[PDB]
């Protein structure tokens, strides 16, 4: 009906998402668990849908749809755990017990027209209005799951001390082989769309803000 969003350690979701966040300092991470982790619209789909493919289920970290089944907690290792929760919000026992994480980084600019397209399909979220209020809030990180600055910088900075291959949605598109390769070596296993949309004077002032944001943080997305 599309309702507020609801805040939770200073991280705005939407209303069912942080629900489903209660029941979640439950969960018991083994050592063989692997967590692919992006920001929405970076790519969480695609990677799962591989790695869902070397294994031979793929559960929603946060989600919980009413009336079925929790259910990876009942499930045979080694687990396949997908999110788009922020390293904030993430369950600590992922962190304590260094299990193997797979992030995805994609072009800020092309995350919010994708994430705007959402917004209009997907009738639970909160309204995204126009484009220009929509790209006024996502460099607000006033959306849900947040800042896409610190989601994508934080899980970088853990990168350095913690076993996350950190990896890039262009590379992703320009090169799939070699990056397959890439999550086959980390499990140990073997086998400008948004120009169109940015008006030069909304690509200016997200530029400035992009440009001060990342001061000091070595991600570069070479384009």
Request: hydrophobic share 35%; glycine share 4%; net charge negative.
């Given at each position: 009906s599309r309702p507020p969003?609801?805040?939770?350690?200073?991280?705005?979701?939407?209303?069912?998402?942080?629900?489903?966040?209660?029941?979640?300092?439950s969960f018991?991470?083994?050592?063989?668990?692997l967590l692919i982790n992006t920001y929405?619209?970076?790519?969480?789909?695609?990677?799962?849908?591989?790695?869902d493919m070397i294994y031979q289920r793929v559960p929603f970290l946060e989600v919980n749809d009413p009336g079925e089944p929790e259910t990876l907690k009942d499930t045979?290792?080694?687990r396949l755990i997908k999110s788009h929760l922020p390293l904030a919000l993430?369950?600590?026992?992922?962190?304590?017990?260094?299990?193997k994480v797979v992030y995805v980084a994609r072009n800020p600019k092309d995350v919010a027209v994708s994430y705007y397209h959402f917004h209009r399909m997907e009738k639970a979220h909160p309204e995204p209005g126009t484009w220009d209020s929509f790209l006024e809030k996502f460099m607000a990180g006033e959306?849900?799951?947040?800042?896409?600055?610190?989601?994508?910088?934080?899980?970088?900075?853990?990168?350095?001390t913690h076993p996350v291959l950190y990896?890039?949605?262009?590379?992703?598109?320009?090169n799939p082989k070699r990056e397959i390769q890439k999550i086959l070596e980390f499990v140990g296993r073997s086998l400008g769309d948004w120009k169109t949309t940015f008006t030069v004077a909304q690509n200016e002032r997200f530029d400035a803000d992009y440009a001060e944001k990342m001061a000091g943080c070595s991600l570069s997305f070479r384009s």
């Amino acid at each position: 009906s599309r309702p507020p969003l609801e805040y939770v350690k200073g991280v705005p979701l939407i209303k069912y998402f942080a629900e489903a966040l209660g029941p979640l300092q439950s969960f018991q991470a083994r050592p063989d668990d692997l967590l692919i982790n992006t920001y929405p619209k970076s790519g969480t789909t695609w990677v799962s849908q591989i790695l869902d493919m070397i294994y031979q289920r793929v559960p929603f970290l946060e989600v919980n749809d009413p009336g079925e089944p929790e259910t990876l907690k009942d499930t045979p290792p080694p687990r396949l755990i997908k999110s788009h929760l922020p390293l904030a919000l993430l369950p600590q026992t992922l962190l304590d017990q260094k299990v193997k994480v797979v992030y995805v980084a994609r072009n800020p600019k092309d995350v919010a027209v994708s994430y705007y397209h959402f917004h209009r399909m997907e009738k639970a979220h909160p309204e995204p209005g126009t484009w220009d209020s929509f790209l006024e809030k996502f460099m607000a990180g006033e959306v849900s799951y947040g800042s896409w600055y610190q989601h994508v910088q934080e899980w970088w900075e853990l990168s350095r001390t913690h076993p996350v291959l950190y990896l890039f949605y262009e590379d992703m598109k320009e090169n799939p082989k070699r990056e397959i390769q890439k999550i086959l070596e980390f499990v140990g296993r073997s086998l400008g769309d948004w120009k169109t949309t940015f008006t030069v004077a909304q690509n200016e002032r997200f530029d400035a803000d992009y440009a001060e944001k990342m001061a000091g943080c070595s991600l570069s997305f070479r384009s």
